[PDB]
Coordinates of C-alpha atoms and ligand atoms in Angstrom, one line a residue:
Chain A
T1 CA 87.0 84.8 91.6
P2 CA 90.0 87.1 90.8
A3 CA 88.6 88.1 87.4
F4 CA 92.0 88.1 85.9
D5 CA 94.4 86.3 88.2
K6 CA 97.8 87.2 86.6
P7 CA 100.3 90.0 87.0
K8 CA 98.7 93.4 86.1
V9 CA 100.0 96.9 85.4
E10 CA 98.3 100.1 86.6
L11 CA 99.1 103.6 85.3
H12 CA 96.2 105.8 86.5
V13 CA 95.7 105.9 90.2
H14 CA 95.5 108.8 92.7
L15 CA 97.2 108.5 96.1
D16 CA 94.6 111.1 97.2
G17 CA 92.0 108.5 96.5
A18 CA 93.7 105.3 97.7
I19 CA 93.8 105.7 101.4
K20 CA 92.8 103.3 104.2
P21 CA 89.7 104.3 106.2
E22 CA 91.4 103.0 109.4
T23 CA 94.4 105.3 109.0
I24 CA 92.2 108.3 108.1
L25 CA 90.4 107.5 111.3
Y26 CA 93.6 107.3 113.2
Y27 CA 94.9 110.8 112.2
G28 CA 91.4 112.2 112.8
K29 CA 91.5 111.2 116.4
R30 CA 95.2 112.1 116.9
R31 CA 94.7 115.6 115.5
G32 CA 91.1 116.2 116.6
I33 CA 90.0 116.7 113.1
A34 CA 86.2 116.2 113.0
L35 CA 85.0 113.2 110.9
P36 CA 81.5 112.1 109.8
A37 CA 81.9 108.6 111.3
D38 CA 83.6 106.4 113.9
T39 CA 83.7 102.9 112.4
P40 CA 86.3 102.3 109.7
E41 CA 83.5 100.4 107.8
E42 CA 80.8 103.0 108.4
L43 CA 83.3 105.5 107.0
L44 CA 83.9 103.7 103.7
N45 CA 80.2 104.2 103.0
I46 CA 80.0 107.9 103.8
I47 CA 83.1 108.5 101.7
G48 CA 82.2 105.9 99.1
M49 CA 79.7 106.0 96.3
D50 CA 77.7 103.1 94.8
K51 CA 75.1 105.3 93.0
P52 CA 76.7 106.8 89.9
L53 CA 76.6 110.5 90.9
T54 CA 78.4 113.4 89.3
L55 CA 81.7 115.4 89.3
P56 CA 80.4 118.0 91.8
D57 CA 79.3 115.4 94.3
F58 CA 82.5 113.3 93.7
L59 CA 84.9 116.1 94.5
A60 CA 82.8 116.7 97.7
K61 CA 84.0 113.4 99.1
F62 CA 87.6 114.6 99.3
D63 CA 86.5 117.2 101.9
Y64 CA 85.4 114.5 104.4
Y65 CA 88.9 113.1 104.8
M66 CA 91.7 115.2 103.3
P67 CA 91.9 117.6 106.2
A68 CA 92.9 114.7 108.4
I69 CA 95.8 113.7 106.2
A70 CA 97.3 116.9 104.7
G71 CA 100.1 118.8 106.4
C72 CA 100.9 115.8 108.6
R73 CA 104.3 114.2 107.8
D74 CA 103.8 111.1 109.8
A75 CA 100.5 110.4 107.8
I76 CA 101.9 111.0 104.3
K77 CA 104.8 108.7 104.5
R78 CA 102.3 106.2 105.8
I79 CA 99.5 106.2 103.1
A80 CA 102.2 106.1 100.4
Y81 CA 103.5 102.9 101.9
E82 CA 100.1 101.4 102.8
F83 CA 99.2 102.2 99.2
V84 CA 101.9 100.0 97.7
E85 CA 100.6 97.1 99.9
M86 CA 97.1 97.4 98.5
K87 CA 98.5 97.3 95.0
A88 CA 100.4 94.1 95.9
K89 CA 97.0 92.8 97.2
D90 CA 95.7 93.1 93.6
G91 CA 97.6 91.5 90.8
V92 CA 99.8 94.5 90.4
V93 CA 103.5 94.2 89.5
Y94 CA 104.1 97.8 88.5
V95 CA 102.3 101.0 89.4
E96 CA 102.5 104.7 88.6
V97 CA 100.8 106.8 91.4
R98 CA 99.7 110.3 91.0
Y99 CA 98.8 113.0 93.6
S100 CA 99.1 116.7 93.9
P101 CA 102.0 117.6 96.3
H102 CA 100.4 121.0 97.0
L103 CA 97.1 119.5 98.0
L104 CA 99.0 117.7 100.9
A105 CA 101.2 120.6 102.0
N106 CA 100.2 123.3 104.5
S107 CA 103.1 125.6 104.4
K108 CA 104.2 127.6 101.3
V109 CA 101.1 127.0 99.2
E110 CA 99.4 129.6 96.9
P111 CA 95.9 129.3 98.3
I112 CA 96.5 127.2 101.4
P113 CA 94.1 124.3 100.8
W114 CA 91.6 122.2 102.8
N115 CA 91.0 125.3 104.9
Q116 CA 93.9 124.3 107.2
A117 CA 96.0 126.8 109.1
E118 CA 99.6 127.6 108.3
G119 CA 101.9 125.8 108.0
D120 CA 105.0 123.6 108.5
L121 CA 104.9 121.1 105.7
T122 CA 106.3 122.4 102.4
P123 CA 105.3 120.7 99.1
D124 CA 108.9 119.9 98.3
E125 CA 109.0 117.8 101.5
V126 CA 105.6 116.2 100.9
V127 CA 107.1 114.9 97.6
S128 CA 110.2 113.7 99.5
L129 CA 108.2 111.9 102.2
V130 CA 106.1 110.2 99.5
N131 CA 109.1 108.9 97.6
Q132 CA 110.3 107.3 100.8
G133 CA 106.9 105.9 101.7
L134 CA 106.9 104.2 98.2
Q135 CA 110.5 103.1 98.2
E136 CA 109.8 101.3 101.5
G137 CA 106.7 99.7 99.9
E138 CA 108.5 98.6 96.7
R139 CA 111.1 96.9 98.8
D140 CA 108.8 95.4 101.3
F141 CA 105.7 94.4 99.3
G142 CA 107.5 93.6 96.0
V143 CA 105.9 95.8 93.5
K144 CA 107.9 98.3 91.5
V145 CA 106.5 101.8 92.1
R146 CA 106.9 105.1 90.4
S147 CA 105.1 108.4 91.0
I148 CA 103.4 111.1 88.9
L149 CA 103.2 114.7 90.2
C150 CA 99.9 116.5 89.3
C151 CA 99.3 120.0 88.2
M152 CA 95.9 121.2 89.1
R153 CA 93.6 122.7 86.4
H154 CA 92.4 125.7 88.4
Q155 CA 95.9 126.6 89.6
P156 CA 98.5 127.4 86.9
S157 CA 100.5 129.2 89.5
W158 CA 101.6 125.9 91.1
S159 CA 102.3 124.0 87.9
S160 CA 105.7 125.7 87.6
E161 CA 106.8 124.1 90.9
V162 CA 105.3 120.8 90.0
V163 CA 107.5 120.4 87.0
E164 CA 110.5 121.6 89.0
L165 CA 109.9 118.9 91.7
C166 CA 109.4 116.4 88.9
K167 CA 112.9 117.3 87.8
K168 CA 114.9 117.1 91.1
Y169 CA 113.1 114.0 92.3
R170 CA 113.6 112.1 89.0
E171 CA 116.1 109.9 90.9
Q172 CA 113.6 109.3 93.7
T173 CA 110.7 107.7 91.8
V174 CA 109.0 110.6 90.0
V175 CA 108.7 109.9 86.3
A176 CA 106.0 112.1 84.9
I177 CA 103.8 115.2 85.2
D178 CA 100.0 115.1 85.1
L179 CA 97.3 117.7 85.0
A180 CA 94.0 116.8 86.8
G181 CA 91.2 118.7 88.5
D182 CA 88.7 120.1 86.0
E183 CA 88.5 119.9 82.2
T184 CA 85.4 122.0 81.8
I185 CA 87.1 125.2 83.2
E186 CA 87.2 127.4 80.2
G187 CA 90.4 127.3 78.1
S188 CA 92.4 125.8 81.1
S189 CA 94.7 123.9 78.8
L190 CA 96.1 127.2 77.5
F191 CA 96.9 128.9 80.8
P192 CA 100.5 130.2 80.4
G193 CA 101.8 128.7 83.7
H194 CA 100.5 125.2 82.7
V195 CA 101.8 125.1 79.1
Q196 CA 105.2 126.5 80.1
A197 CA 105.6 123.7 82.6
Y198 CA 104.8 121.1 80.0
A199 CA 107.2 122.9 77.7
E200 CA 109.9 122.5 80.4
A201 CA 108.8 118.8 80.7
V202 CA 109.4 118.2 77.0
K203 CA 112.7 120.2 77.4
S204 CA 113.9 118.3 80.5
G205 CA 112.8 114.8 79.6
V206 CA 109.9 114.5 82.1
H207 CA 107.2 112.3 80.7
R208 CA 103.7 113.6 80.2
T209 CA 100.1 112.5 80.8
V210 CA 97.0 114.6 81.0
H211 CA 93.5 114.1 82.4
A212 CA 91.3 114.9 79.3
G213 CA 88.2 113.7 77.5
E214 CA 86.7 112.2 80.6
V215 CA 83.9 114.7 80.8
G216 CA 84.8 117.3 78.3
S217 CA 84.8 117.8 74.5
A218 CA 87.2 115.9 72.1
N219 CA 88.8 119.3 71.8
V220 CA 90.2 119.1 75.4
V221 CA 92.1 116.1 74.1
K222 CA 93.3 118.0 71.0
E223 CA 94.7 120.8 73.3
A224 CA 96.5 118.2 75.5
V225 CA 98.2 116.5 72.6
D226 CA 99.0 119.6 70.5
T227 CA 100.2 122.4 72.8
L228 CA 100.6 120.4 76.0
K229 CA 102.4 117.5 74.1
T230 CA 101.0 114.7 76.2
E231 CA 102.5 111.3 75.7
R232 CA 99.5 109.6 77.3
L233 CA 95.9 110.3 78.0
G234 CA 94.0 110.2 81.3
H235 CA 90.6 108.7 80.7
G236 CA 90.0 110.1 77.2
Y237 CA 86.5 108.9 76.4
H238 CA 85.0 111.7 74.5
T239 CA 87.8 111.7 72.0
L240 CA 85.4 109.4 70.0
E241 CA 83.5 112.6 69.0
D242 CA 86.2 113.5 66.4
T243 CA 87.0 110.6 64.1
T244 CA 89.9 112.5 62.4
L245 CA 91.8 113.1 65.7
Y246 CA 90.8 109.7 67.1
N247 CA 92.1 107.9 64.1
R248 CA 95.3 110.0 63.9
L249 CA 95.8 109.2 67.6
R250 CA 95.6 105.4 67.0
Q251 CA 98.0 106.1 64.1
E252 CA 100.6 107.9 66.3
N253 CA 100.0 105.1 68.9
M254 CA 98.5 107.2 71.8
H255 CA 97.9 105.5 75.1
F256 CA 94.5 105.7 76.9
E257 CA 94.5 105.2 80.6
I258 CA 91.0 103.9 81.2
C259 CA 89.1 103.8 84.4
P260 CA 85.9 101.7 83.8
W261 CA 84.4 101.6 87.3
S262 CA 85.4 105.2 87.7
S263 CA 83.5 106.3 84.6
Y264 CA 80.3 104.7 85.7
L265 CA 80.6 106.4 89.1
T266 CA 81.8 109.9 88.0
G267 CA 78.9 109.8 85.5
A268 CA 81.5 110.5 82.7
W269 CA 79.9 107.4 81.0
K270 CA 76.2 107.5 80.5
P271 CA 75.2 103.8 81.0
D272 CA 72.9 103.8 78.0
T273 CA 75.9 103.9 75.6
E274 CA 78.3 101.1 75.0
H275 CA 81.3 102.0 77.2
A276 CA 84.0 104.0 75.4
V277 CA 86.2 100.9 76.0
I278 CA 84.5 98.1 74.0
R279 CA 85.2 100.2 70.9
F280 CA 88.8 100.6 72.0
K281 CA 89.1 96.9 72.3
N282 CA 87.6 96.3 68.9
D283 CA 89.7 99.0 67.3
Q284 CA 92.8 97.4 68.8
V285 CA 93.8 100.6 70.4
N286 CA 96.7 101.2 72.9
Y287 CA 95.0 101.3 76.3
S288 CA 95.2 100.2 80.0
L289 CA 92.8 99.3 82.8
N290 CA 93.1 101.4 85.9
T291 CA 91.2 102.1 89.1
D292 CA 91.5 106.0 89.6
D293 CA 90.3 106.5 93.2
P294 CA 89.6 103.1 94.7
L295 CA 88.8 104.5 98.1
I296 CA 85.8 106.5 96.9
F297 CA 84.8 103.9 94.4
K298 CA 84.8 101.2 97.2
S299 CA 86.9 99.3 94.6
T300 CA 89.9 97.0 94.2
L301 CA 91.6 96.7 90.8
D302 CA 89.6 93.5 90.5
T303 CA 86.4 95.5 90.4
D304 CA 87.5 97.1 87.1
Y305 CA 88.4 93.7 85.6
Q306 CA 85.2 92.1 86.9
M307 CA 83.3 94.9 85.1
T308 CA 84.9 94.5 81.7
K309 CA 84.8 90.7 81.7
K310 CA 81.1 90.5 82.7
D311 CA 79.5 93.7 81.4
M312 CA 81.4 93.6 78.1
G313 CA 82.8 90.1 77.4
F314 CA 86.5 90.8 77.8
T315 CA 88.6 87.7 77.3
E316 CA 91.9 86.8 79.0
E317 CA 93.6 87.2 75.6
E318 CA 92.5 90.8 75.6
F319 CA 93.5 91.3 79.3
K320 CA 96.9 90.0 78.5
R321 CA 97.6 92.3 75.5
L322 CA 96.4 95.6 77.2
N323 CA 98.7 94.9 80.1
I324 CA 101.5 94.4 77.6
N325 CA 100.5 97.7 76.2
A326 CA 100.4 99.5 79.6
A327 CA 103.9 98.2 80.1
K328 CA 105.0 99.4 76.7
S329 CA 103.5 102.8 77.3
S330 CA 104.8 103.0 80.9
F331 CA 107.2 105.8 81.9
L332 CA 110.1 103.6 82.8
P333 CA 113.6 103.9 81.3
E334 CA 114.1 101.6 78.3
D335 CA 116.1 99.3 80.5
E336 CA 113.5 98.3 83.0
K337 CA 110.6 98.5 80.5
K338 CA 112.4 95.5 78.8
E339 CA 112.4 93.5 82.1
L340 CA 108.8 94.5 83.0
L341 CA 107.8 93.0 79.7
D342 CA 110.0 89.9 80.3
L343 CA 108.2 89.4 83.6
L344 CA 104.9 89.7 81.8
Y345 CA 105.7 87.6 78.8
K346 CA 106.9 84.8 81.1
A347 CA 103.8 84.9 83.3
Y348 CA 101.5 84.8 80.2
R349 CA 103.7 82.3 78.2
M350 CA 104.5 84.1 74.9
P351 CA 107.7 85.0 73.0
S352 CA 110.1 87.4 74.8
Chain B
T1 CA 126.9 122.1 115.6
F2 CA 123.7 120.1 116.0
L3 CA 121.5 119.2 119.0
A4 CA 119.2 116.2 118.3
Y5 CA 116.5 115.2 120.7
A6 CA 113.5 113.0 121.2
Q7 CA 110.0 114.1 122.1
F8 CA 107.6 111.8 124.0
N9 CA 103.9 112.1 124.1
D10 CA 102.3 110.3 127.1
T11 CA 98.8 111.8 126.7
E12 CA 97.0 108.4 126.8
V13 CA 99.4 106.4 128.8
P14 CA 97.5 105.3 131.9
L15 CA 98.9 106.2 135.3
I16 CA 100.1 103.9 138.1
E17 CA 99.1 105.4 141.4
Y18 CA 100.4 104.6 144.9
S19 CA 100.6 106.2 148.4
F20 CA 103.7 108.0 149.6
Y21 CA 103.8 108.7 153.4
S22 CA 106.7 111.0 153.9
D23 CA 107.9 112.3 157.3
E24 CA 105.4 111.5 160.0
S25 CA 104.7 115.3 160.1
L26 CA 102.7 114.8 156.8
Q27 CA 99.1 114.5 157.9
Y28 CA 97.5 113.1 154.7
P29 CA 99.5 110.6 152.5
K30 CA 100.5 111.8 149.1
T31 CA 99.3 109.9 146.0
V32 CA 102.2 109.6 143.6
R33 CA 100.9 109.1 140.0
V34 CA 103.1 108.2 137.1
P35 CA 102.5 107.6 133.4
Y36 CA 103.4 103.9 133.1
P37 CA 102.3 101.5 130.4
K38 CA 101.7 98.0 131.8
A39 CA 101.8 95.1 129.4
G40 CA 99.5 95.6 126.4
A41 CA 98.3 99.0 127.6
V42 CA 98.7 102.3 125.6
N43 CA 102.3 103.2 125.0
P44 CA 103.9 106.7 124.6
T45 CA 104.5 107.9 121.1
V46 CA 107.8 109.4 120.0
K47 CA 109.1 112.1 117.6
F48 CA 112.7 113.0 116.6
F49 CA 114.2 116.4 115.9
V50 CA 117.5 118.1 115.1
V51 CA 118.2 121.8 115.6
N52 CA 121.2 123.9 114.5
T53 CA 122.7 125.6 117.5
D54 CA 124.8 127.8 115.3
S55 CA 121.9 129.6 113.7
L56 CA 120.0 130.5 116.9
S57 CA 118.3 133.8 117.0
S58 CA 117.0 135.4 120.2
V59 CA 114.5 137.2 117.9
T60 CA 113.1 134.0 116.4
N61 CA 111.9 130.8 117.9
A62 CA 114.3 128.0 116.9
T63 CA 113.5 125.9 113.9
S64 CA 113.5 122.3 115.0
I65 CA 113.7 119.8 112.1
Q66 CA 111.8 116.6 112.4
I67 CA 113.0 113.3 111.1
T68 CA 110.0 111.0 110.8
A69 CA 110.1 107.3 111.6
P70 CA 110.4 104.8 108.7
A71 CA 107.1 104.0 107.0
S72 CA 107.4 100.4 108.0
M73 CA 107.4 101.5 111.6
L74 CA 104.6 104.0 111.2
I75 CA 101.9 101.4 110.5
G76 CA 101.6 100.6 114.2
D77 CA 103.2 101.2 117.6
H78 CA 107.0 101.5 117.6
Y79 CA 110.0 102.8 119.6
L80 CA 113.0 104.9 118.9
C81 CA 115.7 102.8 120.4
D82 CA 119.1 104.1 119.4
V83 CA 120.6 107.3 118.2
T84 CA 124.2 107.5 117.2
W85 CA 126.0 110.3 115.4
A86 CA 128.2 109.1 112.5
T87 CA 129.8 112.3 111.1
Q88 CA 129.4 116.1 111.6
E89 CA 126.5 115.9 109.1
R90 CA 125.3 112.3 109.3
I91 CA 123.1 110.7 112.0
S92 CA 121.9 107.1 112.4
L93 CA 118.7 106.1 114.0
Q94 CA 117.3 102.7 115.0
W95 CA 113.6 102.1 115.3
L96 CA 111.8 99.0 116.8
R97 CA 108.3 97.7 116.3
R98 CA 106.1 97.2 119.4
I99 CA 106.4 93.5 118.5
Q100 CA 110.1 93.7 119.1
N101 CA 111.3 91.2 116.5
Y102 CA 111.6 93.6 113.6
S103 CA 113.8 96.8 113.6
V104 CA 115.0 99.3 111.1
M105 CA 118.1 101.6 110.9
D106 CA 117.9 105.0 109.1
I107 CA 121.0 106.9 108.0
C108 CA 120.4 110.6 107.6
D109 CA 122.4 113.3 105.9
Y110 CA 122.1 117.0 106.3
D111 CA 120.9 118.6 103.1
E112 CA 122.5 122.0 102.4
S113 CA 119.9 123.3 100.0
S114 CA 116.8 122.2 102.0
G115 CA 118.1 122.4 105.5
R116 CA 116.3 119.2 106.6
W117 CA 117.6 115.7 107.0
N118 CA 117.5 113.3 104.1
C119 CA 117.1 109.6 105.1
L120 CA 118.0 107.6 102.0
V121 CA 115.8 104.5 102.0
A122 CA 118.5 102.8 100.0
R123 CA 120.6 103.2 103.1
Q124 CA 118.1 101.5 105.5
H125 CA 119.1 98.2 107.0
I126 CA 116.4 95.8 108.2
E127 CA 117.2 93.6 111.2
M128 CA 114.9 90.9 112.5
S129 CA 114.7 87.6 114.4
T130 CA 112.5 84.5 113.9
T131 CA 113.5 82.7 117.1
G132 CA 113.0 85.7 119.5
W133 CA 113.5 89.4 119.8
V134 CA 116.1 91.7 118.3
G135 CA 119.3 92.3 120.4
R136 CA 120.2 91.3 123.9
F137 CA 117.8 93.9 125.3
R138 CA 117.5 96.1 122.3
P139 CA 119.3 96.5 118.9
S140 CA 123.0 97.0 119.3
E141 CA 124.7 100.3 118.7
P142 CA 126.7 100.9 115.5
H143 CA 130.3 102.2 115.5
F144 CA 131.2 104.1 112.4
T145 CA 134.6 104.6 110.7
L146 CA 135.8 108.2 110.7
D147 CA 134.5 109.0 107.2
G148 CA 131.2 107.4 108.3
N149 CA 130.6 105.3 105.2
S150 CA 130.8 102.0 107.0
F151 CA 130.1 100.8 110.6
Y152 CA 130.6 97.8 112.9
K153 CA 127.7 96.4 114.9
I154 CA 127.1 93.3 117.0
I155 CA 124.5 91.1 115.4
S156 CA 123.5 87.4 116.0
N157 CA 124.8 85.1 113.3
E158 CA 122.9 82.1 111.8
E159 CA 124.4 79.7 114.3
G160 CA 122.8 82.0 116.8
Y161 CA 126.0 83.7 118.2
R162 CA 126.5 87.4 118.7
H163 CA 129.4 88.6 116.6
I164 CA 130.7 91.8 115.1
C165 CA 129.3 92.5 111.7
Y166 CA 130.7 94.9 109.1
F167 CA 128.4 97.2 107.1
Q168 CA 128.6 99.5 104.1
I169 CA 126.1 102.4 104.3
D170 CA 124.3 101.4 101.0
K171 CA 125.2 97.7 100.5
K172 CA 122.5 95.7 102.0
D173 CA 124.4 92.7 103.5
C174 CA 127.3 92.7 106.0
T175 CA 130.4 90.7 106.7
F176 CA 131.0 88.9 110.0
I177 CA 134.5 89.7 111.2
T178 CA 134.4 87.2 114.0
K179 CA 132.8 83.7 114.4
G180 CA 133.0 81.0 117.1
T181 CA 131.1 79.3 119.9
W182 CA 131.1 82.4 122.1
Ligands
LIG1 C1 100.1 114.3 122.2 O1 99.3 113.3 121.6 C2 98.0 113.7 121.8 C3 97.2 112.6 121.0 O2 96.3 112.1 122.0 C4 97.6 115.1 121.3 O3 96.5 115.6 122.0 C5 95.5 115.8 121.0 O4 95.7 117.1 120.4 C6 94.8 117.2 119.3 C7 95.4 118.3 118.4 O5 95.3 119.5 119.0 C8 93.5 117.5 119.9 O6 92.5 118.0 119.1 C9 92.2 119.4 119.3 O7 91.2 119.6 120.4 C10 90.8 121.0 120.5 C11 89.8 121.2 121.7 O8 89.0 120.0 122.0 C12 90.2 121.4 119.2 O9 89.6 122.7 119.3 C13 91.4 121.5 118.2 O10 91.4 122.3 117.1 C14 90.6 122.0 116.0 O11 89.3 122.5 116.2 C15 88.4 122.3 115.1 C16 88.2 120.8 114.8 O12 87.3 120.5 113.8 C17 88.8 123.1 114.0 O13 88.8 124.5 114.4 C18 90.2 122.8 113.5 O14 90.3 121.6 112.7 C19 91.2 122.6 114.7 O15 92.2 121.7 114.2 C20 91.8 120.0 118.0 O16 90.7 119.3 117.5 C21 93.0 116.3 120.6 O17 91.9 116.6 121.4 C22 94.1 115.6 121.5 N1 93.8 114.2 121.6 C23 93.2 113.6 122.6 C24 91.8 113.0 122.3 O18 93.8 113.5 123.7 C25 98.7 116.1 121.3 O19 98.6 117.0 120.2 C26 100.1 115.5 121.2 N2 101.2 116.5 121.5 C27 102.2 116.6 120.7 C28 103.2 117.7 121.1 O20 102.3 116.0 119.7
LIG2 C1 131.4 121.5 112.8 O1 130.6 120.8 111.8 C2 129.7 121.7 111.1 C3 128.8 120.8 110.3 O2 129.5 120.4 109.1 C4 130.5 122.7 110.3 O3 129.5 123.6 109.8 C5 129.6 123.9 108.4 O4 130.7 124.8 108.1 C6 131.0 124.9 106.8 C7 132.0 126.1 106.7 O5 133.3 125.7 106.8 C8 129.8 125.1 105.8 O6 130.1 124.4 104.6 C9 128.5 124.6 106.3 O7 127.5 125.4 105.8 C10 128.4 124.5 107.8 N1 127.2 123.8 108.2 C11 126.2 124.4 108.8 C12 125.2 125.3 108.0 O8 126.0 124.3 110.0 C13 131.6 123.4 111.1 O9 132.6 123.8 110.2 C14 132.3 122.5 112.2 N2 133.1 123.3 113.1 C15 132.7 124.3 113.9 C16 132.0 125.5 113.2 O10 132.9 124.3 115.1
NAG3 C1 107.6 131.3 120.2 O1 106.6 130.4 120.5 C2 105.7 130.6 121.6 C3 104.6 129.5 121.7 O2 104.2 129.1 120.4 C4 105.0 132.0 121.4 O3 104.1 132.2 122.5 C5 106.1 133.0 121.3 O4 105.5 134.2 121.1 C6 107.0 132.7 120.1 N1 108.1 133.8 120.0 C7 108.3 134.5 118.9 C8 109.5 135.3 118.8 O5 107.5 134.6 117.9
NAG4 C1 107.4 88.3 115.3 O1 107.0 87.4 116.3 C2 105.6 87.1 116.3 C3 105.3 86.1 117.4 O2 105.9 84.8 117.1 C4 105.0 86.6 115.0 O3 103.7 87.0 115.0 C5 105.7 87.2 113.7 O4 105.8 86.2 112.7 C6 107.2 87.7 113.9 N1 107.4 88.7 112.9 C7 108.5 88.8 112.2 C8 108.5 89.8 111.1 O5 109.5 88.1 112.5
ZN5 ZN1 92.1 110.4 87.5

């Protein structure tokens, strides 16, 4: 049964990690990019985890498929569209999607990624294609969709462009800047290229979220809020290791993008503990339920709601209010945030 | 200024083969073979490019700029089925799904700072049929006004009659300027 069969809101999901096996498989054959399988279904297994491995083995899954997609215009605009559909197939009524535009380009890229040759597709045009792939999904599948452009932790060089793209494509669906990749790289959060980008984000009105606290000290979180000035937090588990900061964060109403099924599988949550979330629920904190990389997790957004309802006795009353929260914390103009809430309040049945 | 063109990839389109006999001087019959997709077989695939003939080099290979199909078209087989220039810097394209009851029009503008073609999705125009296929044999061609902000096009009305409809580049509906039993 559809664990929570009402409208939902999703804020933390990577395009990178929400692709269709079938369409990876298609571009593999078309481009002659070698692939570790031939069934669509056999492939979801080789790419997917069900044993909760670790962040090295997780990032290794990207290498199986990404060479087939990146640098290929036809493919990008597609997955962006196909993505919106899979969101509509879950409860979702509004999504924010993140990806790194550099990770999909093959021309004009600092270290040209995925060991692919030069080089026709510039990152500026990847972003452009994506928008259009999403616009065409929003229209067709009937879920409002905005995008978040990722900076990459190990690449402060890029992060300047990222914010600049965020700026020019603010009309075409990009609403925020993220920073993913690797927390545990020493003093990443302070790299001049990164922080100056986030400075320009604040300066230019570009909203801000940061991957932090997932597998990394509470201090990574501190850095993100303080110098980076993040409005929202990706994952953010191990912020419960500093009760001062944690309680001042609840005070200042910080939003926590939570990825339950993700945590289990990344190993960022050791299963002996209560999940970082049950506490968040009990502390009445501002948080949302997300899926992260549903392709690699072999998951739908229902998997993350199934988990919290079963494993940790989440009620529909809770599910309702965290989605209200997600909507409140969303990076929409004031404007549409009002009507997103309206849609939500009406569906549920509370005062609007 | 610009030369647009289509590119067709027939790699996996099967071949029809038949004998050709020629003048009786030809001792062994020639086998003609032709990429030709019979019903339900593998079709060609298409791509679309525009090149600027004014900035041609003779020291550099020409930059051809691709305009991808709409995403709705990309999820399966499709066709490029009409191209019609609208202004000096605006080009309109019509795509059609292999199941020929759904088609999409793109309207693309030259982008000075990028040097590629922007196809505003806001400017798309979906066209479809529930009772059959789109167009008499294909989607009809648009005729634009001089400034290229609006165009006329023959589309079937709801009584089922083909009449001239009047479109605004970004407004999603159109106005019939003729009706009747003809
Ligand atoms: C017309 O459409 C067809 C699609 O059928 C297409 O022909 C295909 O071209 C792709 C792209 O080149 C071919 O794949 C290549 O095959 C060769 C030799 O077998 C490979 O060496 C190529 O280079 C790769 O080699 C390694 C692969 O792991 C790596 O070194 C690296 O990743 C290289 O990319 C590449 O695999 C493919 O064989 C055909 N498809 C078939 C099966 O017919 C053609 O490209 C299209 N033409 C145009 C203009 O679009
Ligand atoms: C034909 O149309 C083209 C496309 O608009 C014109 O080319 C532009 O010329 C003006 C200069 O007057 C510039 O603003 C643009 O940069 C040009 N576009 C480019 C880069 O091709 C042209 O004026 C027209 N007439 C000609 C040259 O025959
Ligand atoms: C242009 O392209 C062809 C084929 O890719 C190549 O052989 C030729 O050397 C190129 N010319 C220049 C000027 O680089
Ligand atoms: C197109 O026609 C086919 C056959 O009747 C049918 O599968 C489908 O509903 C139609 N699709 C659209 C979008 O009209
Ligand atoms: Zn993430």
